[PDB]
Design a protein around this ligand. Structure first.
Ligand code: NI
Length: 179
C-alpha cells in the first residue's frame, strides 16, 4: 500500500525518510482533499496496458514520455536534482507513473506542513496545478518514471513564492471545498 507521512523537523539529507515522531501517517483520502490522486498499476505492462489506457482516456493524458534519473545516464544530473527539490508549482497537472525504482514527492497540506509521499514501482500520482511540491530520490538513488501530460507538455516550475498565478488562485479555491 502506498505510504505517505508528515515529515520531521530536520533539514539535512533530503533522501532519508524524515518520518515525524511519533509516526503521523497520511491516508489516500487525506491526499484527495489536497487534490492529489493515485492509481496502482502493473508497471511491467506499461508498454501495453489497458488499465493505464483507461486512466489516460479518462483524464485526457494524451502525451507521455519516460525519464530515468540516474547519476550516470541523466544529463546535467546534479543541477536537475537540485532543481527538482526546490519547492515549486506548475500551471498544469504533474503526472508521474513509476516504472522502476522509487522516490519522494513532498506536498504542502492545508496548513502548509510538508507531507512526504513514497512512490514505488507501479504507483501513479497526479499533483494538481497550483500545489506546492518538490521531488527527491530516496536512498536507493534511482527512479524510472513515465511523465504524462494533458496535451503538449510545458515543464516550467515556478519556485515559491508563486502566489500570483491563476492556477494557484484556483487551487486555493478548490481547497476551500474539500474536507
Ligand atoms: Ni514539479
Amino acid at each position: 500500500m502506498v505510504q505517505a507521512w508528515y515529515m520531521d523537523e530536520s533539514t539535512a539529507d533530503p533522501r532519508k525518510p524524515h518520518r515525524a515522531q511519533p509516526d503521523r501517517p497520511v491516508s489516500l483520502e487525506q491526499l484527495r482533499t489536497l487534490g492529489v490522486l493515485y492509481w496502482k498499476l502493473d508497471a511491467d505492462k506499461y508498454e501495453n496496458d489497458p488499465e493505464l489506457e483507461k486512466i489516460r482516456k479518462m483524464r485526457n493524458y494524451s502525451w507521455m514520455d519516460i525519464i530515468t534519473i540516474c547519476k550516470d545516464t541523466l544529463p546535467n544530473y546534479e543541477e536537475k536534482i537540485k532543481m527538482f527539490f526546490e519547492e515549486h508549482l506548475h500551471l498544469d497537472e504533474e503526472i508521474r507513473y513509476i516504472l522502476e525504482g522509487s522516490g519522494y514527492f513532498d506536498v504542502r497540506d492545508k496548513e502548509d506542513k510538508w507531507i512526504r509521499i513514497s512512490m514505488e514501482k507501479g504507483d501513479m500520482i497526479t499533483l494538481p496545478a497550483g500545489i506546492y511540491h518538490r521531488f527527491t530520490l530516496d536512498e536507493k538513488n534511482y527512479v524510472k518514471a513515465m511523465r504524462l501530460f494533458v496535451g503538449e507538455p510545458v515543464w516550467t516550475p515556478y519556485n515559491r513564492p508563486a502566489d500570483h498565478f491563476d492556477a494557484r488562485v484556483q487551487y486555493m479555491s478548490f481547497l476551500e471545498g474539500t474536507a
